[PDB]
Design a protein around this ligand. Structure first.
Ligand SMILES: CCCCCCCCCCCCCCCCCC(=O)O[C@@H](COC(=O)CCCCCCCCCCCCCCC)COP(=O)(O)OCC[N+](C)(C)C
Ligand SMILES: CCCCCCCCCCCCCCCCCCCC(=O)O[C@H](COC(=O)CCCCCCCCCCCCCC)COP(=O)(O)OCCN
Ligand SMILES: CCCCCCCCCCCCCCCCCC(=O)OC[C@H](COP(=O)(O)O)OC(=O)CCCCCCCCCCCCCCCCC
Lengths: 57, 48, 28
């Protein structure tokens, strides 16, 4: 808690590390949520929802 | 006074100076005096 | 303020390298 909260505000290197970590985690979390809602909005329309997927003849 | 060593000075300066608000009073031909934001930015060093 | 800063800026550089290049799988 207070250790990181005192390092981030007092040393720019720690703040820069915090920015990089936040970018990484936030971009992954939005990629994940945006794909979850995309999957929910398109039920049955996926390539792997094809019933005959695997029998061409 | 003797109890005030270099580490004490740095601790006190970090309490009172580092990234702190400042009050400015100026008079005369002061157009080249930098604005409040410049003074405020110069209270910390981003290289550290 | 010189060794601690060097360590901090090295940690930031390593984190930024892990963030730009994401070799999750090269931990072998
Ligand atoms: C293009 C612009 C370059 C980034 C600017 C960096 C900078 O000036 O430092 C910023 C930092 O803000 C940023 O915008 C940081 C940018 C992050 C850069 C990400 C690094 C990318 C990694 C490169 C590849 C690494 C591998 C080698 C300082 O922000 P302040 O609001 O002044 O806060 C610092 C003061 N205090 C410590 C008291 C909190
Ligand atoms: C030329 C490179 C710009 C960096 C630079 O020399 O600025 C210093 C640190 O700034 C910085 O903010 C340097 C840190 C860079 C962060 C990483 C950027 C990667 C892209 C000085 O700034 P100072 O605040 O130490 O001295 C100012 C006194 N007020
Ligand atoms: C507009 C922006 C301006 C500011 C930025 C300017 C550019 C800044 C530097 C950018 C280049 C450095 C970052 C490299 C990141 C690597 C990318 C990565 O991880 O790829 C994953 C990526 C995966 O893509 P995915 O499948 O879509 O996830 O894989 C690749 O792209 C593999 C190939 C990467 C090789 C790039 C090498 C760059 C040139 C290095 C020097 C070449 C000359 C050396 C000659 C030696 C002679 C002695």
């Amino acid at each position: 808690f207070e250790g990181f909260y005192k390092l981030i505000m007092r040393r720019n290197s720690v703040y820069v590390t915090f920015i990089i970590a936040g970018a990484f985690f936030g971009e992954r979390a939005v990629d994940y949520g945006v794909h979850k809602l995309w999957e929910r909005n398109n039920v049955g329309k996926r390539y792997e929802d094809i019933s005959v997927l695997g029998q061409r003849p | 006074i003797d109890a005030v060593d270099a580490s004490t000075v740095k601790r006190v300066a970090n309490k009172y100076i580092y990234d702190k608000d400042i009050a400015i009073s100026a008079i005369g031909p002061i157009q080249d005096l930098p604005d409040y934001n410049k003074f405020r930015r110069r209270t910390y060093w981003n290289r550290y | 303020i010189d060794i601690q800063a060097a360590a901090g800026w090295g940690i930031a550089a390593a984190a930024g390298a892990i963030w730009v290049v994401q070799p999750f799988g090269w931990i072998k």
